[PDB]
Assembly symmetry: C2
Protein backbone atom coordinates (compact mmCIF):
# COMPACT_ATOMS: atom_id res chain seq x y z
CA UNK A 1 0.00 0.00 0.00
CA UNK A 2 1.52 3.33 -1.10
CA UNK A 3 -0.20 6.72 -1.22
CA UNK A 4 0.84 10.32 -0.59
CA UNK A 5 -1.09 13.55 -0.42
CA UNK A 6 0.37 17.06 -0.64
CA UNK A 7 -1.55 19.88 1.04
CA UNK A 8 -0.55 23.17 -0.50
CA UNK A 9 -1.88 25.18 2.50
CA UNK A 10 0.86 23.69 4.74
CA UNK A 11 3.32 22.36 2.16
CA UNK A 12 3.15 18.99 3.96
CA UNK A 13 2.83 15.48 2.51
CA UNK A 14 0.49 13.00 4.22
CA UNK A 15 1.68 9.43 3.69
CA UNK A 16 0.73 5.78 4.23
CA UNK A 17 4.14 4.95 5.76
CA UNK A 18 7.07 6.72 7.45
CA UNK A 19 9.05 6.27 4.20
CA UNK A 20 6.86 5.16 1.21
CA UNK A 21 8.55 2.48 -0.99
CA UNK A 22 6.94 3.71 -4.22
CA UNK A 23 7.88 7.41 -4.19
CA UNK A 24 10.14 10.18 -2.85
CA UNK A 25 8.54 13.58 -2.15
CA UNK A 26 9.91 17.11 -1.78
CA UNK A 27 8.65 20.17 0.16
CA UNK A 28 7.89 21.92 -3.17
CA UNK A 29 5.10 19.37 -3.78
CA UNK A 30 7.00 17.36 -6.40
CA UNK A 31 7.50 13.57 -6.50
CA UNK A 32 10.05 11.10 -7.86
CA UNK A 33 8.66 7.66 -8.74
CA UNK A 34 10.72 4.78 -7.21
CA UNK A 35 8.47 1.90 -8.29
CA UNK A 36 7.43 1.38 -11.92
CA UNK A 37 3.70 0.70 -12.11
CA UNK A 38 0.21 2.04 -12.65
CA UNK A 39 -0.54 5.16 -10.64
CA UNK A 40 -3.58 7.23 -9.99
CA UNK A 41 -2.53 10.90 -9.97
CA UNK A 42 -5.19 13.02 -8.29
CA UNK A 43 -5.90 16.39 -6.69
CA UNK A 44 -8.06 19.52 -6.72
CA UNK A 45 -6.63 22.95 -7.63
CA UNK A 46 -8.65 25.86 -6.25
CA UNK A 47 -8.37 29.08 -8.25
CA UNK A 48 -8.74 32.57 -6.85
CA UNK A 49 -12.23 33.95 -7.56
CA UNK A 50 -12.07 35.41 -11.09
CA UNK A 51 -13.66 38.59 -9.66
CA UNK A 52 -10.08 39.26 -8.34
CA UNK A 53 -8.07 38.33 -11.46
CA UNK A 54 -8.06 41.50 -13.56
CA UNK A 55 -6.16 40.43 -16.64
CA UNK A 56 -6.69 37.98 -19.48
CA UNK A 57 -4.21 35.38 -18.17
CA UNK A 58 -5.90 31.95 -18.40
CA UNK A 59 -6.20 29.54 -15.48
CA UNK A 60 -4.11 26.57 -16.63
CA UNK A 61 -2.80 23.54 -14.77
CA UNK A 62 -0.34 21.03 -16.29
CA UNK A 63 1.00 17.80 -14.89
CA UNK A 64 4.48 16.82 -16.09
CA UNK A 65 6.27 13.48 -16.14
CA UNK A 66 9.96 14.37 -16.42
CA UNK A 67 9.99 16.82 -19.34
CA UNK A 68 6.78 15.48 -20.94
CA UNK A 69 3.31 17.01 -20.46
CA UNK A 70 0.91 14.29 -19.14
CA UNK A 71 -2.12 16.61 -19.31
CA UNK A 72 -3.12 20.23 -19.69
CA UNK A 73 -6.26 21.56 -18.04
CA UNK A 74 -8.06 24.89 -18.12
CA UNK A 75 -11.39 26.26 -17.01
CA UNK A 76 -12.79 29.72 -16.20
CA UNK A 77 -11.34 29.86 -12.68
CA UNK A 78 -13.45 27.06 -11.17
CA UNK A 79 -12.37 24.18 -8.90
CA UNK A 80 -10.18 21.86 -11.00
CA UNK A 81 -9.91 18.14 -10.28
CA UNK A 82 -6.73 16.82 -11.92
CA UNK A 83 -5.01 13.58 -12.92
CA UNK A 84 -6.07 10.10 -13.96
CA UNK A 85 -4.54 6.66 -14.37
CA UNK A 86 -1.00 6.73 -15.83
CA UNK A 87 1.70 4.08 -16.29
CA UNK A 88 4.88 5.39 -14.61
CA UNK A 89 8.52 4.19 -14.44
CA UNK A 90 11.17 4.08 -11.70
CA UNK A 91 12.98 7.42 -11.94
CA UNK A 92 10.08 9.55 -13.29
CA UNK A 93 9.67 13.00 -11.79
CA UNK A 94 6.05 14.12 -11.39
CA UNK A 95 5.10 17.78 -10.81
CA UNK A 96 2.52 20.45 -11.48
CA UNK A 97 2.93 23.59 -13.51
CA UNK A 98 0.64 26.62 -13.28
CA UNK A 99 0.16 29.36 -15.89
CA UNK A 100 0.36 31.72 -12.89
CA UNK A 101 0.94 30.59 -9.31
CA UNK A 102 -0.95 33.80 -8.28
CA UNK A 103 -4.13 32.07 -9.62
CA UNK A 104 -3.93 29.36 -6.98
CA UNK A 105 -5.66 29.47 -3.64
CA UNK A 106 -3.53 27.44 -1.21
CA UNK A 107 -6.49 26.58 1.08
CA UNK A 108 -7.99 23.25 0.03
CA UNK A 109 -5.63 22.75 -2.93
CA UNK A 110 -4.02 19.30 -2.84
CA UNK A 111 -2.53 16.65 -5.09
CA UNK A 112 -0.78 13.31 -4.85
CA UNK A 113 -0.48 9.78 -6.19
CA UNK A 114 -1.48 6.33 -5.23
CA UNK A 115 0.18 3.13 -6.45
CA UNK A 116 -2.71 1.16 -7.87
CA UNK A 117 -3.38 -2.46 -7.06
CA UNK A 118 -3.80 -4.82 -10.03
CA UNK A 119 -7.38 -4.98 -11.37
CA UNK A 120 -7.50 -8.47 -12.92
CA UNK A 121 -11.18 -9.16 -12.37
CA UNK A 122 -13.89 -7.90 -14.69
CA UNK A 123 -17.65 -7.81 -14.25
CA UNK B 1 -7.46 -3.17 -0.83
CA UNK B 2 -10.54 -2.09 -2.79
CA UNK B 3 -10.61 -0.37 -6.20
CA UNK B 4 -12.95 -0.45 -9.20
CA UNK B 5 -12.76 1.18 -12.62
CA UNK B 6 -15.64 1.42 -15.07
CA UNK B 7 -14.60 1.42 -18.74
CA UNK B 8 -17.30 3.24 -20.69
CA UNK B 9 -16.24 1.65 -24.04
CA UNK B 10 -17.16 -1.86 -22.82
CA UNK B 11 -19.43 -1.12 -19.84
CA UNK B 12 -17.26 -3.37 -17.72
CA UNK B 13 -15.92 -2.79 -14.22
CA UNK B 14 -12.28 -3.78 -13.59
CA UNK B 15 -11.81 -4.83 -10.01
CA UNK B 16 -9.24 -5.68 -7.34
CA UNK B 17 -11.30 -8.72 -6.27
CA UNK B 18 -14.01 -11.01 -7.69
CA UNK B 19 -16.38 -9.42 -5.16
CA UNK B 20 -14.95 -6.10 -3.75
CA UNK B 21 -15.95 -5.67 -0.06
CA UNK B 22 -16.25 -1.84 -0.24
CA UNK B 23 -18.55 -1.39 -3.22
CA UNK B 24 -21.38 -2.86 -5.26
CA UNK B 25 -21.12 -2.11 -8.98
CA UNK B 26 -23.70 -2.27 -11.73
CA UNK B 27 -23.48 -2.54 -15.54
CA UNK B 28 -25.15 0.88 -15.96
CA UNK B 29 -21.90 2.30 -14.50
CA UNK B 30 -23.34 3.11 -11.09
CA UNK B 31 -22.05 2.02 -7.71
CA UNK B 32 -23.09 1.78 -4.08
CA UNK B 33 -20.64 2.18 -1.23
CA UNK B 34 -20.76 -0.80 1.18
CA UNK B 35 -17.97 0.24 3.54
CA UNK B 36 -17.94 3.67 5.24
CA UNK B 37 -14.66 5.50 4.71
CA UNK B 38 -12.46 7.95 2.87
CA UNK B 39 -12.57 7.35 -0.88
CA UNK B 40 -10.91 8.77 -3.89
CA UNK B 41 -13.46 9.22 -6.66
CA UNK B 42 -11.66 9.56 -10.01
CA UNK B 43 -12.06 9.28 -13.74
CA UNK B 44 -11.56 11.03 -17.02
CA UNK B 45 -14.44 12.10 -19.26
CA UNK B 46 -13.21 12.62 -22.83
CA UNK B 47 -15.38 14.84 -25.07
CA UNK B 48 -15.86 14.22 -28.79
CA UNK B 49 -14.39 16.89 -31.11
CA UNK B 50 -16.73 19.93 -31.25
CA UNK B 51 -17.02 19.44 -35.05
CA UNK B 52 -19.22 16.37 -34.26
CA UNK B 53 -21.53 18.10 -31.75
CA UNK B 54 -25.05 18.36 -33.19
CA UNK B 55 -26.95 19.53 -30.10
CA UNK B 56 -26.95 22.87 -28.27
CA UNK B 57 -26.26 21.51 -24.76
CA UNK B 58 -23.15 22.60 -22.86
CA UNK B 59 -20.47 20.02 -21.80
CA UNK B 60 -21.41 19.26 -18.21
CA UNK B 61 -20.57 16.33 -15.97
CA UNK B 62 -22.09 15.77 -12.53
CA UNK B 63 -21.21 13.24 -9.86
CA UNK B 64 -24.25 12.37 -7.70
CA UNK B 65 -24.20 11.05 -4.16
CA UNK B 66 -27.61 9.53 -3.44
CA UNK B 67 -30.05 12.12 -4.80
CA UNK B 68 -27.81 15.17 -4.48
CA UNK B 69 -25.01 16.57 -6.67
CA UNK B 70 -21.58 16.04 -5.09
CA UNK B 71 -19.65 17.68 -7.90
CA UNK B 72 -20.53 19.72 -10.99
CA UNK B 73 -17.93 19.96 -13.71
CA UNK B 74 -17.88 21.93 -16.95
CA UNK B 75 -15.54 23.18 -19.63
CA UNK B 76 -15.48 23.96 -23.38
CA UNK B 77 -15.43 20.29 -24.55
CA UNK B 78 -11.96 19.49 -23.22
CA UNK B 79 -10.48 16.58 -21.29
CA UNK B 80 -12.21 16.38 -17.90
CA UNK B 81 -10.67 14.58 -14.88
CA UNK B 82 -13.31 14.24 -12.19
CA UNK B 83 -13.53 13.47 -8.48
CA UNK B 84 -11.35 14.08 -5.44
CA UNK B 85 -11.19 12.79 -1.86
CA UNK B 86 -14.63 12.30 -0.20
CA UNK B 87 -15.94 10.75 3.03
CA UNK B 88 -18.66 8.33 2.02
CA UNK B 89 -20.90 6.04 3.99
CA UNK B 90 -22.33 2.55 3.59
CA UNK B 91 -25.41 2.96 1.40
CA UNK B 92 -24.20 5.92 -0.65
CA UNK B 93 -25.12 5.53 -4.34
CA UNK B 94 -22.53 7.24 -6.60
CA UNK B 95 -23.15 7.84 -10.30
CA UNK B 96 -22.32 10.20 -13.15
CA UNK B 97 -24.79 12.38 -15.04
CA UNK B 98 -23.88 13.80 -18.46
CA UNK B 99 -25.79 16.64 -20.12
CA UNK B 100 -25.63 14.73 -23.36
CA UNK B 101 -24.35 11.20 -23.95
CA UNK B 102 -23.53 12.27 -27.50
CA UNK B 103 -20.78 14.54 -26.03
CA UNK B 104 -18.80 11.61 -24.73
CA UNK B 105 -16.07 9.68 -26.49
CA UNK B 106 -16.62 6.30 -24.82
CA UNK B 107 -13.26 4.75 -25.80
CA UNK B 108 -11.03 6.47 -23.23
CA UNK B 109 -13.69 7.58 -20.75
CA UNK B 110 -13.58 5.83 -17.37
CA UNK B 111 -14.39 6.37 -13.69
CA UNK B 112 -14.40 4.61 -10.33
CA UNK B 113 -13.44 4.69 -6.68
CA UNK B 114 -10.71 3.46 -4.45
CA UNK B 115 -11.02 3.06 -0.71
CA UNK B 116 -8.06 5.05 0.65
CA UNK B 117 -5.63 3.78 3.28
CA UNK B 118 -5.05 6.04 6.30
CA UNK B 119 -2.35 8.68 5.76
CA UNK B 120 -0.94 9.01 9.28
CA UNK B 121 2.64 10.10 8.45
CA UNK B 122 3.23 13.77 7.89
CA UNK B 123 6.00 15.80 6.47
Amino acid sequence: SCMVKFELSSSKWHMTSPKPHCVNTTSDGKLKILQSGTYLIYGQVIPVDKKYIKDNAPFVVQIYKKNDVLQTLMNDFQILPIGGVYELHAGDNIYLKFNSKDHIQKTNTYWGIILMPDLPFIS
